[PDB]
Design an enzyme around this catalytic site. Structure first.
Site, PDB file in Angstrom:
ATOM      1  N   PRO A 128      48.038  33.997  43.256  1.00 53.72           N
ATOM      2  CA  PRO A 128      49.112  33.182  43.780  1.00 53.72           C
ATOM      3  C   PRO A 128      50.396  33.169  42.986  1.00 53.72           C
ATOM      4  O   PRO A 128      51.459  33.328  43.556  1.00 53.72           O
ATOM      5  CB  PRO A 128      48.496  31.805  43.702  1.00 53.72           C
ATOM      6  CG  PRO A 128      47.707  31.861  42.467  1.00 53.72           C
ATOM      7  CD  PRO A 128      47.274  33.268  42.247  1.00 53.72           C
TER       8      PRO A 128
ATOM      9  N   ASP B 179      34.877  49.521  38.416  1.00 56.84           N
ATOM     10  CA  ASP B 179      34.343  48.442  39.265  1.00 56.84           C
ATOM     11  C   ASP B 179      35.385  47.417  39.669  1.00 56.84           C
ATOM     12  O   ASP B 179      35.166  46.646  40.580  1.00 56.84           O
ATOM     13  CB  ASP B 179      33.340  47.599  38.459  1.00 56.84           C
ATOM     14  CG  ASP B 179      31.899  47.912  38.765  1.00 56.84           C
ATOM     15  OD1 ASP B 179      31.594  48.315  39.921  1.00 56.84           O
ATOM     16  OD2 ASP B 179      31.074  47.709  37.822  1.00 56.84           O
ATOM     17  N   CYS B 180      36.476  47.363  38.915  1.00 58.52           N
ATOM     18  CA  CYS B 180      37.307  46.155  38.761  1.00 58.52           C
ATOM     19  C   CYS B 180      38.729  46.482  39.251  1.00 58.52           C
ATOM     20  O   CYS B 180      39.028  47.655  39.554  1.00 58.52           O
ATOM     21  CB  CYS B 180      37.261  45.718  37.270  1.00 58.52           C
ATOM     22  SG  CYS B 180      38.599  44.641  36.623  1.00 58.52           S
TER      23      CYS B 180
ATOM     24  N   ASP C 196      42.999  44.659  39.182  1.00 61.17           N
ATOM     25  CA  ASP C 196      43.935  43.542  38.884  1.00 61.17           C
ATOM     26  C   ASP C 196      44.133  42.680  40.120  1.00 61.17           C
ATOM     27  O   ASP C 196      44.789  43.118  41.054  1.00 61.17           O
ATOM     28  CB  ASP C 196      45.325  44.041  38.426  1.00 61.17           C
ATOM     29  CG  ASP C 196      46.288  42.879  37.979  1.00 61.17           C
ATOM     30  OD1 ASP C 196      46.088  41.686  38.286  1.00 61.17           O
ATOM     31  OD2 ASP C 196      47.278  43.144  37.292  1.00 61.17           O
TER      32      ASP C 196
ATOM     33  N   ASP D 235      35.918  43.765  26.731  1.00 63.96           N
ATOM     34  CA  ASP D 235      36.764  43.547  27.888  1.00 63.96           C
ATOM     35  C   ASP D 235      37.479  44.861  28.242  1.00 63.96           C
ATOM     36  O   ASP D 235      38.007  45.554  27.352  1.00 63.96           O
ATOM     37  CB  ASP D 235      37.778  42.451  27.560  1.00 63.96           C
ATOM     38  CG  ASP D 235      38.664  42.091  28.730  1.00 63.96           C
ATOM     39  OD1 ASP D 235      38.446  42.575  29.867  1.00 63.96           O
ATOM     40  OD2 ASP D 235      39.601  41.307  28.500  1.00 63.96           O
ATOM     41  N   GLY D 236      37.476  45.198  29.538  1.00 64.41           N
ATOM     42  CA  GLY D 236      38.087  46.442  30.039  1.00 64.41           C
ATOM     43  C   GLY D 236      39.600  46.488  29.892  1.00 64.41           C
ATOM     44  O   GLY D 236      40.198  47.554  29.672  1.00 64.41           O
TER      45      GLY D 236
ATOM     46  N   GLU E 265      31.703  47.884  29.033  1.00 66.13           N
ATOM     47  CA  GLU E 265      31.031  46.824  29.789  1.00 66.13           C
ATOM     48  C   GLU E 265      31.166  45.470  29.095  1.00 66.13           C
ATOM     49  O   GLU E 265      31.257  45.394  27.862  1.00 66.13           O
ATOM     50  CB  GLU E 265      29.558  47.179  30.000  1.00 66.13           C
ATOM     51  CG  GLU E 265      28.834  46.267  30.957  1.00 66.13           C
ATOM     52  CD  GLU E 265      29.495  46.208  32.322  1.00 66.13           C
ATOM     53  OE1 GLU E 265      29.371  47.199  33.068  1.00 66.13           O
ATOM     54  OE2 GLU E 265      30.131  45.176  32.650  1.00 66.13           O
TER      55      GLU E 265
ATOM     56  N   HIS F 202      28.081  55.328  44.880  1.00 64.04           N
ATOM     57  CA  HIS F 202      28.275  56.013  43.609  1.00 64.04           C
ATOM     58  C   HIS F 202      28.643  57.455  43.770  1.00 64.04           C
ATOM     59  O   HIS F 202      29.465  57.949  43.027  1.00 64.04           O
ATOM     60  CB  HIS F 202      27.068  55.863  42.731  1.00 64.04           C
ATOM     61  CG  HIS F 202      26.844  54.454  42.319  1.00 64.04           C
ATOM     62  ND1 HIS F 202      25.907  53.651  42.921  1.00 64.04           N
ATOM     63  CD2 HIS F 202      27.469  53.685  41.395  1.00 64.04           C
ATOM     64  CE1 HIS F 202      25.949  52.450  42.365  1.00 64.04           C
ATOM     65  NE2 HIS F 202      26.880  52.447  41.427  1.00 64.04           N
TER      66      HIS F 202
END
Lengths: 270, 282
Positions: free
Chosen positions: B159, B152-153, B155, B134-135, B102, B58
């Site tokens: 595939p 945190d996330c 893209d 949703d972020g 969140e 952090h």
């Protein structure tokens, strides 16, 4: 089938075993080599991981080049420990080095590793400048009256150090592996205190080796030349360009940065 | 004790002695105490956070950008239900508004109860706002606008996916003030670098300066972890350590991992990582 590291009682790393290549157990000791999908061949002694085929490069590159290139002109190098020969391999890659000596506890541990961990040495033992000695490293406080520019201690007594200094040429550097620093720093504090008795400039650099669990590992740095770890990244870069290694972790940015320590470690040393 | 094994990878992992389970629900979610690392949260067999070492994560995720950007007044945190990130962002007196988006309000009050030292009272801060959404759907904004976004996330590499286009990274840019920075956690880099390559490729479509910095978090197994860095201000990652040090002297954080040497050095990447990224263009 799986295999757990036992180095700490409270937590560890573990690996799937695809195949065991070698296993030996005495009432006193236990030595193993097995293949794992992720990290290739894994050597472990008394439940503690010694080296891994796939990540040893980080350890050995950082252990070797940082001093060799910080020192400008290392012509003779002593390796203490390093039976696997990975260290030898890297030191070998400097054309300017003219002699290399490996002191090792016994001639068994080397030809063993030679057979089961061939990619560590990578044919390095055939190098013309190499010499193997079988002895206590500490014994080399005996000296053959021999004398070096870099000493790499690949495994930490005070006896070991005075000896190290007696036989280091004037400009020389001693580096040693000094354990992972997250859990405890006493080993670092003690090393610093001891080394400082024999050397006028004592500090640490760091690298994070996946298979030595717990974040960054710390390498002791000891020398009477107090400039060597304040070199500009430019000059390291010049030296790096030729003699020209092509490393896989190391580079001159990394080298310089290696010497930034996280705040907890620094605090602990004051 | 009893042992608990991480399952993130099939071939190898980390494990911990369990001294006591504080919570278990089988989404398989668990919180237990371990002698070395304190409280350990794990979800579907993968360690999310640890009481004892979360600071490294952090700190590096929050201060590197905040102090590289000079003057971050509004920050958006995406993910970070534990509130450790909120805690650290909080320590910058100059910040005047903080927003945490969140996935649900449950995951936050849960962590608030079981991981109290993560937030450390940080949720009581006057400048804080929690959003449940949703972020990626904060591609809508409330016409809101930020100077740093911390995710945190990321893209995900996929595939049949796109190689340059993301709804998420575009949204992030729509709502970033002009000087702004986006950082995101981009996984440990030893085993594979495809996730870094893909991140770089996508982020480069929306930002003119895209790179990574790193830190080694004990409890995310496998050496160094990589943090994506994306911005239109291309000087942000080439600041002298001197200026960082100035900015650091105060506002005066006292940090336990972070410092200006660390900050600067964080951007040195090991050779393998660079060569993996070398294809991506000059």
């Amino acid at each position: 089938k799986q295999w757990h590291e036992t180095l700490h009682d409270q937590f560890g790393q573990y690996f799937a075993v695809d195949n065991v290549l070698y296993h030996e157990k005495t009432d006193h000791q236990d030595l193993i080599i097995f293949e794992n999908a992720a990290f290739g061949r894994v050597m472990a002694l008394d439940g503690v991981v010694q080296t891994t085929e796939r990540d040893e490069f980080i350890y050995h590159e950082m252990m070797t080049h940082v001093p060799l290139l910080a020192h400008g002109h290392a012509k003779h190098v002593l390796i203490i420990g390093g039976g696997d020969g990975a260290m030898l391999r890297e030191v070998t890659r400097h054309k300017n080095v003219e002699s290399i000596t490996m002191v090792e506890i016994d001639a068994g541990v080397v030809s063993f590793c030679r057979q089961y961990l061939p990619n560590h040495n990578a044919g390095s033992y055939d190098d013309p400048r190499f010499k193997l000695v079988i002895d206590d490293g500490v014994n080399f406080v005996n000296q053959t009256s021999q004398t070096f520019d870099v000493i790499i201690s690949d495994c930490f007594t005070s006896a070991f150090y005075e000896g190290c200094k007696r036989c280091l040429n004037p400009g020389g550097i001693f580096v040693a592996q000094n354990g992972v620093c997250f859990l405890q720093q006493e080993e670092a504090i003690d090393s610093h205190r001891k080394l400082s008795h024999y050397f006028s400039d004592v500090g640490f650099y760091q690298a994070a080796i996946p298979t030595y669990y717990g974040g960054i590992m710390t390498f002791a740095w000891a020398t009477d030349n107090d400039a060597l770890r304040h070199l500009s990244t430019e000059i390291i870069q010049a030296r790096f360009l030729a003699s020209g290694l092509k490393c896989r972790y190391y580079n001159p940015a990394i080298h310089t940065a290696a010497f930034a320590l996280p705040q907890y470690l620094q605090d602990a040393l004051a």
